[PDB]
PDB file of N, CA and C in Angstrom:
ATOM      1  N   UNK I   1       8.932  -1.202 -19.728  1.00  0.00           N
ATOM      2  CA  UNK I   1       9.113  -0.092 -18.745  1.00  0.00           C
ATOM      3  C   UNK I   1      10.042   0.965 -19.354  1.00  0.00           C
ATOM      4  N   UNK I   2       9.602   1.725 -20.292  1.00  0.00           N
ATOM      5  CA  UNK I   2      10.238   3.057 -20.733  1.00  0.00           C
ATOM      6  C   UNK I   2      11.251   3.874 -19.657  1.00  0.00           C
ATOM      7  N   UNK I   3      10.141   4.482 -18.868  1.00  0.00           N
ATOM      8  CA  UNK I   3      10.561   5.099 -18.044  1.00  0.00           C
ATOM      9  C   UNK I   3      11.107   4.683 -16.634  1.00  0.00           C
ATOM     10  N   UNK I   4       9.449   4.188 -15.694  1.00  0.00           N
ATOM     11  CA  UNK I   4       9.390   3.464 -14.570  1.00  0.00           C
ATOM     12  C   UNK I   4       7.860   2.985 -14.654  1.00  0.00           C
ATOM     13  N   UNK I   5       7.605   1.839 -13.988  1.00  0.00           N
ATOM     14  CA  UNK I   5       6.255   1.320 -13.854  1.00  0.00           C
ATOM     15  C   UNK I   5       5.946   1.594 -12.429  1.00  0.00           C
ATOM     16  N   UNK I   6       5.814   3.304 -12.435  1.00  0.00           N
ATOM     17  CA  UNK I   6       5.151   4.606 -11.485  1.00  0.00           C
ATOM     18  C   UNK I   6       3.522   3.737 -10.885  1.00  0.00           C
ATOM     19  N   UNK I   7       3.094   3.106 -12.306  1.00  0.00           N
ATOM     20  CA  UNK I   7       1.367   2.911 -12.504  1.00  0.00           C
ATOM     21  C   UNK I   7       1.009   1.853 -11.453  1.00  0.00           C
ATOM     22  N   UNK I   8       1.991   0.754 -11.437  1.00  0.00           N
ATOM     23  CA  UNK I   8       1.793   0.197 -10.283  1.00  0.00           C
ATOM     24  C   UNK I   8       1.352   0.702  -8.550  1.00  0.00           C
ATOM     25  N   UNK I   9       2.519   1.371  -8.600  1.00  0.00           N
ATOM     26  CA  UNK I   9       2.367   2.070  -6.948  1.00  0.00           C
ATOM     27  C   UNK I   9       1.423   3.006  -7.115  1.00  0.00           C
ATOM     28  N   UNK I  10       0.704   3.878  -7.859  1.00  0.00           N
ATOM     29  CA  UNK I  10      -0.581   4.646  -8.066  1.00  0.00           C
ATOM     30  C   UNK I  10      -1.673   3.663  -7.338  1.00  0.00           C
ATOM     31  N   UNK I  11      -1.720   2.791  -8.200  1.00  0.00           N
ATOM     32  CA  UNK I  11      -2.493   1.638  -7.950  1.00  0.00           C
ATOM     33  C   UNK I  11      -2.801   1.505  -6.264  1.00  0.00           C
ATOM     34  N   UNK I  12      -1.633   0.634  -5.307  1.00  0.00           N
ATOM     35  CA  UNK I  12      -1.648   0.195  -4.481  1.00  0.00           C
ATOM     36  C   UNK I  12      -1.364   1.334  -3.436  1.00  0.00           C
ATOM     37  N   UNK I  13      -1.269   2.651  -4.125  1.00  0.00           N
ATOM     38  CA  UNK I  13      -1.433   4.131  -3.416  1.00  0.00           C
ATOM     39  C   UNK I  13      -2.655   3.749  -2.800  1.00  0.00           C
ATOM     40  N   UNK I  14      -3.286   4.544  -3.673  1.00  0.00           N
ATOM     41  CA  UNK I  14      -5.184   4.592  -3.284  1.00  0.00           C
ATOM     42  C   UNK I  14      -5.680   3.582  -2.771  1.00  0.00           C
ATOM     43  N   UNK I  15      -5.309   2.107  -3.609  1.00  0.00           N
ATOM     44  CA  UNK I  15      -6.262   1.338  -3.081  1.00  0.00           C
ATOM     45  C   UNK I  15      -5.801   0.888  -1.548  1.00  0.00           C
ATOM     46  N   UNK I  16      -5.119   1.304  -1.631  1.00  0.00           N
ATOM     47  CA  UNK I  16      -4.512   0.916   0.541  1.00  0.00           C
ATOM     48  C   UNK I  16      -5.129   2.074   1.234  1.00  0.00           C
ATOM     49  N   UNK I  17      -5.435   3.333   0.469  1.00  0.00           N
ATOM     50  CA  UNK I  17      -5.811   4.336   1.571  1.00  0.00           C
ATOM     51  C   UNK I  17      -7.613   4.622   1.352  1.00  0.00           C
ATOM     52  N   UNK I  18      -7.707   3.549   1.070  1.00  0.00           N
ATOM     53  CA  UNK I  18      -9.029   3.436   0.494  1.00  0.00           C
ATOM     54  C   UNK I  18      -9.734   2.558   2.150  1.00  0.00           C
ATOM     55  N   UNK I  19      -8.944   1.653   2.627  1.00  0.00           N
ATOM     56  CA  UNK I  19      -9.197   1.004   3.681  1.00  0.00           C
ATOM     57  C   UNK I  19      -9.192   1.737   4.855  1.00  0.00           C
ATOM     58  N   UNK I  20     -10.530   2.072   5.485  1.00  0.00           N
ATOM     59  CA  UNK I  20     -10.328   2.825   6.773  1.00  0.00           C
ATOM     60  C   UNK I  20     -10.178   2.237   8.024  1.00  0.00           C
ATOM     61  N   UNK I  21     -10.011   0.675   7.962  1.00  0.00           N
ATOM     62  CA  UNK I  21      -9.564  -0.049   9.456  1.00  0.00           C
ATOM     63  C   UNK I  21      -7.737   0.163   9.955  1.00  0.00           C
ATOM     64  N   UNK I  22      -7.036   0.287   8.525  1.00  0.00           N
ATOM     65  CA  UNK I  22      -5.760   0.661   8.916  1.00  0.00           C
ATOM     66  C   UNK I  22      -5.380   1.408   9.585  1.00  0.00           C
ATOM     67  N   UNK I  23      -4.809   1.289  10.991  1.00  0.00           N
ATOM     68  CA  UNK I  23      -4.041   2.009  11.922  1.00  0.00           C
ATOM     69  C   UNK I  23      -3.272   2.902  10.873  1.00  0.00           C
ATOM     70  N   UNK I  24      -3.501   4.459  11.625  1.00  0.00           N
ATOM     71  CA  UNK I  24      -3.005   5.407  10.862  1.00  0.00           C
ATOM     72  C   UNK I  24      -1.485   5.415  10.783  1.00  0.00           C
ATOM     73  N   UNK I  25      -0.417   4.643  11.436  1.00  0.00           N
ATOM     74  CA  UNK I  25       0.770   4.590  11.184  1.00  0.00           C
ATOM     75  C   UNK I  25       1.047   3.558  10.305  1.00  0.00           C
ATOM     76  N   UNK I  26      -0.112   2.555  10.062  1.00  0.00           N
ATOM     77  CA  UNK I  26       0.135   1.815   9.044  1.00  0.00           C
ATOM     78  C   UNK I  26      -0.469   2.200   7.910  1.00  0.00           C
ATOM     79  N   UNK I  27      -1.167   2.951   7.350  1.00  0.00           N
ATOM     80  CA  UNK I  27      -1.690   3.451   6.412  1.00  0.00           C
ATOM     81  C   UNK I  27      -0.807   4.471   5.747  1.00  0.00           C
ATOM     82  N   UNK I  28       0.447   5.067   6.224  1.00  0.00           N
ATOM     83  CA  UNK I  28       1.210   6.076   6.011  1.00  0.00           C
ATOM     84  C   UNK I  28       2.716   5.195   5.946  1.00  0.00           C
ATOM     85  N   UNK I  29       2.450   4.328   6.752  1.00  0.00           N
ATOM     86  CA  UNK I  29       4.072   3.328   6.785  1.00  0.00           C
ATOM     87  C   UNK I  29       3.730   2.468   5.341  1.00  0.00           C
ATOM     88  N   UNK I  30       2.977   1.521   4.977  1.00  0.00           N
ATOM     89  CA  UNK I  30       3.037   0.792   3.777  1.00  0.00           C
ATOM     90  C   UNK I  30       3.177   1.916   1.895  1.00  0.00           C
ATOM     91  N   UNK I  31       2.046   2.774   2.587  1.00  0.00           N
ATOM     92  CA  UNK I  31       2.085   4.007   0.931  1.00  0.00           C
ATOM     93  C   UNK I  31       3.805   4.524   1.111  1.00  0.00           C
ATOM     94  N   UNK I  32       4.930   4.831   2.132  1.00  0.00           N
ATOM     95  CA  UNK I  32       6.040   4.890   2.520  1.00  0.00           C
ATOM     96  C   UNK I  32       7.019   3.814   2.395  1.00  0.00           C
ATOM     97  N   UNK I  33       7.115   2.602   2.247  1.00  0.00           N
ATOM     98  CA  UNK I  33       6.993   1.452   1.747  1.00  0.00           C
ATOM     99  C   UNK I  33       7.381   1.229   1.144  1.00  0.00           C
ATOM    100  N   UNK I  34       6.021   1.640  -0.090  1.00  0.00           N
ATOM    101  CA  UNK I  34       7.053   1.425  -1.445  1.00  0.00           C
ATOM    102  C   UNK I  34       7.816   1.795  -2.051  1.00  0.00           C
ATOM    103  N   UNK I  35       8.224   3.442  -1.708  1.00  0.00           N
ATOM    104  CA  UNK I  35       9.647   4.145  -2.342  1.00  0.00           C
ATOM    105  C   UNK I  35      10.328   3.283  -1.321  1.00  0.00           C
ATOM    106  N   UNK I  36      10.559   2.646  -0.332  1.00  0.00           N
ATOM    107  CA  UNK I  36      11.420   2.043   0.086  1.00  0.00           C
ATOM    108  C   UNK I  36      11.971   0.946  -0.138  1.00  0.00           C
ATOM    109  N   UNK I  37      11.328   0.251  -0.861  1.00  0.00           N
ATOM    110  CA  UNK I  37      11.283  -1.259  -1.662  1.00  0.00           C
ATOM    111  C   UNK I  37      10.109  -1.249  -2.772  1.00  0.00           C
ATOM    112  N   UNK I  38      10.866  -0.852  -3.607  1.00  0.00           N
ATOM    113  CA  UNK I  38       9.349  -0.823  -4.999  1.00  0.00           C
ATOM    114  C   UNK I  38       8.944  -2.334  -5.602  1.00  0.00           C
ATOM    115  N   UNK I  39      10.134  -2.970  -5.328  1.00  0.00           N
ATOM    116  CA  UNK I  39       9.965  -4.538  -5.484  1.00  0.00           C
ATOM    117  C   UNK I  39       8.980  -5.298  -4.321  1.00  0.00           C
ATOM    118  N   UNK I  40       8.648  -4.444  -3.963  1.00  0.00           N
ATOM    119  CA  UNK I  40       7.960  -5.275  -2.769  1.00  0.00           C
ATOM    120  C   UNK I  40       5.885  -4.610  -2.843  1.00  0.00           C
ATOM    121  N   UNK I  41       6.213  -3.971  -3.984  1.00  0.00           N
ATOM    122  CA  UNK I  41       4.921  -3.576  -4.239  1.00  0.00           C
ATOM    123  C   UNK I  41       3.395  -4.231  -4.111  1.00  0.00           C
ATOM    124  N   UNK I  42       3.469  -5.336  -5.324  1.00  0.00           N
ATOM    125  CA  UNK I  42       2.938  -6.957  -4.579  1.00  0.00           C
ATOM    126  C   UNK I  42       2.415  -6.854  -3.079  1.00  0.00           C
ATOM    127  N   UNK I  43       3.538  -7.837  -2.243  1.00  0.00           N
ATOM    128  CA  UNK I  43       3.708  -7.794  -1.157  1.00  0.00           C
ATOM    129  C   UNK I  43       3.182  -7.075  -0.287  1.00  0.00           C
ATOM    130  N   UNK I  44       3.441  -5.474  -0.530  1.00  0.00           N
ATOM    131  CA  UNK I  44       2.861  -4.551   0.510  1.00  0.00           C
ATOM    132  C   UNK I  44       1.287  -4.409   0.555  1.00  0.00           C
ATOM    133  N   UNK I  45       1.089  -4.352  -0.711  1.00  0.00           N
ATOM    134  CA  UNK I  45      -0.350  -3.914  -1.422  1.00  0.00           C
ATOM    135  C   UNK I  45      -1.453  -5.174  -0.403  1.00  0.00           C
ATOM    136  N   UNK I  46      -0.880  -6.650  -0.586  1.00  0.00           N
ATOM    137  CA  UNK I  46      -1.551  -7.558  -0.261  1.00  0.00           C
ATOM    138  C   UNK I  46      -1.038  -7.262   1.060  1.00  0.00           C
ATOM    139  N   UNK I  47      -0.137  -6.894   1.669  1.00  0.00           N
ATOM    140  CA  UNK I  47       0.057  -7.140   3.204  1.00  0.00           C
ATOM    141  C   UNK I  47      -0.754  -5.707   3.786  1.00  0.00           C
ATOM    142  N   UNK I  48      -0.865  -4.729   2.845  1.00  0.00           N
ATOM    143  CA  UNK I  48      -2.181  -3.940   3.814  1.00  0.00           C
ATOM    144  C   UNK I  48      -3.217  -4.556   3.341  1.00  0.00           C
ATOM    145  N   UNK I  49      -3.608  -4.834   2.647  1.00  0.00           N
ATOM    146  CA  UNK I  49      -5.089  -5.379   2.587  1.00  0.00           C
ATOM    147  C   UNK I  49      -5.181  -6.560   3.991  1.00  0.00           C
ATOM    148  N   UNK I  50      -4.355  -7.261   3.633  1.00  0.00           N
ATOM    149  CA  UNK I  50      -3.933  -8.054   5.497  1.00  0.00           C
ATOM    150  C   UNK I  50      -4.484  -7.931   6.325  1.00  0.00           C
ATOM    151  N   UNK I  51      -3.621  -6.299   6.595  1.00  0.00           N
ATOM    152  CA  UNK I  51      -3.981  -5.727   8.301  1.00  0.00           C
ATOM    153  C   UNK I  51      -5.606  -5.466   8.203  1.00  0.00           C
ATOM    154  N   UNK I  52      -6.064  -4.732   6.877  1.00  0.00           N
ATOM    155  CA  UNK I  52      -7.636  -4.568   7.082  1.00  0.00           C
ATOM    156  C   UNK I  52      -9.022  -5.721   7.133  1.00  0.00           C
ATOM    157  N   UNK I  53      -8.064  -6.499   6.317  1.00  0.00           N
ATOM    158  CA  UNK I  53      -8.961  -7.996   6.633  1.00  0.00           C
ATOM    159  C   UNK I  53      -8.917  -8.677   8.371  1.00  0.00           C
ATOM    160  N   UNK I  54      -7.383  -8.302   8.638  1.00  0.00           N
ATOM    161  CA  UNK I  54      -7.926  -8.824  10.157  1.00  0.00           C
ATOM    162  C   UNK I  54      -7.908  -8.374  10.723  1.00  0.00           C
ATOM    163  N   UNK I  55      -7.720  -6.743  11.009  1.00  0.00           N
ATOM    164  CA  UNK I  55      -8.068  -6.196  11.758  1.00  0.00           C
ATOM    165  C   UNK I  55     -10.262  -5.384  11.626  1.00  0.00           C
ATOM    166  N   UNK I  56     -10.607  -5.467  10.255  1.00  0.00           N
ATOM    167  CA  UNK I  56     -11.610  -5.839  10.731  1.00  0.00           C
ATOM    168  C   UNK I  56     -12.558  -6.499  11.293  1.00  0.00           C
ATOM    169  N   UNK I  57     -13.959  -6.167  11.850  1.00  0.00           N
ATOM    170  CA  UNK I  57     -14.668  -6.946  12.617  1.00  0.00           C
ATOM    171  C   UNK I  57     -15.282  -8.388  12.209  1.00  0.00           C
ATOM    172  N   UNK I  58     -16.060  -9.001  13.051  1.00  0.00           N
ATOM    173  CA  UNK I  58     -16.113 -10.508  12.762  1.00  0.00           C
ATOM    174  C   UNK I  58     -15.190 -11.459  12.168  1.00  0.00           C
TER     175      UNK I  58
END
């Protein structure tokens, strides 16, 4: 990590806003998130994928 490993949260940027079942305060609260805990990047990435797995249907 030269600088910062930025490439990560790019990553779990898009691919969280990529999910359109996320409640729009959660879709804006987790990408918000991770400047708030970058260690928790992991975590968040899989905990929105979460909300869209169960909050989608069947």
């Amino acid at each position: 990590v030269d600088n910062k490993f930025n490439k990560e949260m790019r990553n779990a940027y898009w691919e969280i806003a990529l999910l359109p079942n996320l409640n729009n305060q959660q879709k804006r609260a987790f990408i918000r998130s991770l400047y708030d805990d970058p260690s928790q990047s992991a975590n968040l990435l899989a905990e929105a994928k979460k909300l869209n797995d169960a909050q989608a249907p069947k």
